[PDB]
Amino acid sequence: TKAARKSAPATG
Amino acid sequence: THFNQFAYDGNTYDLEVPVLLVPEDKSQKPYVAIIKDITQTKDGSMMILGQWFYRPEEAEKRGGGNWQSSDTRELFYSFHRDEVPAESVMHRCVVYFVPAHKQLPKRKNNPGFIVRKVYDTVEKKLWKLTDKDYEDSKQREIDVLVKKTMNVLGDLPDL
């Protein structure tokens, strides 16, 4: 059961 | 190679349904994401494309603060998408997209998350379910989700 990683998007 | 459904741990998951995911950081709450695509990598692992939901206390405000959740069930949708492993899913959950005119369902009737806003990650702001700021395709996505919520919840108790 792998984990899910969230990316960090470019913001203003 | 794309898939319309995928089976894991005895549960079958389709497209355009919300799911809970084991978080990257252990201290995080379980992530909530809409399944947009089910693909198979070159090495044979199965990855799902997920469109994140943001909890009001973790979504960054432009002013640098955080929002106050009106209701414990409140979630912010978004267009932030990420490929996460299929084995990371826990189970399918319930997420209700209820417009501003209709009021929320009752807790003991239909428990689950409720969405009244969409989080703009670029500008760090909130869009309503129907808004002129949307592009055509994004407004279409939000309308599809609101329609899917409406086919489940027939009655529209207005405020």
Author numbering:
A (entry chain P): 22 to 33
B (entry chain A): 119 to 277
Please give the exact wording used by the authors of the publication that reports this structure.
Here, we demonstrated that the BAH domain-containing protein anti-silencing 1 (ASI1)-IMMUNOPRECIPITATED PROTEIN 3 (AIPP3) and two PHD domain-containing proteins AIPP2/PARALOG OF AIPP2 (PAIPP2) could form a BAH–PHD module to read H3K27me3 and unmethylated H3K4, respectively, and coordinate in implementing transcriptional repression of hundreds of genes, particularly those development and stress-responsive genes in Arabidopsis, such as the florigen gene FT and the RNA silencing effector gene AGO5. We also revealed that the BAH–PHD module represses the release of Pol II from TSS regions by cooperating with CPL2, a known plant-specific Pol II carboxyl terminal domain (CTD)-Ser5 phosphatase. Thus, the evidence above fully demonstrated that AIPP3-BAH is a H3K27me3-reader module.
To gain molecular insight into the interaction between the AIPP3-BAH domain and H3K27me3, we successfully determined the crystal structure of the AIPP3-BAH domain in complex with an H3K27me3 peptide at a resolution of 2.4 Å. Overall, the AIPP3-BAH domain has a classic β-barrel structure that is similar to other reported BAH domain structures. The H3K27me3 peptide has a good electron density map and a β-strand-like extended conformation. The peptide is captured by a negatively charged cavity that is formed on the surface of the AIPP3-BAH domain with extensive hydrophobic and hydrophilic interactions. In detail, the three aromatic residues of the AIPP3-BAH domain, Tyr149, Trp170, and Tyr172, form an aromatic cage to accommodate the trimethyl-lysine of the H3K27me3 peptide, and it resembles other typical methyl-lysine-reading histone readers. In the middle, the AIPP3 residues Trp170, Tyr172, His198, and Asp200 form an extensive hydrogen-binding network with H3S28, which further fixes the imidazole ring of His198 in a special rotamer state that is parallel with the prolyl ring of H3P30. This parallel alignment of the two rings enables the CH-π, and stacking interactions between AIPP3 His198 and H3P30, which resemble the recognition of H3K27me3 by the EBS and SHL BAH domains with conserved key residues. In the C-terminus, H3G33 interacts with AIPP3 Val240 through a main chain–main chain hydrogen bond.
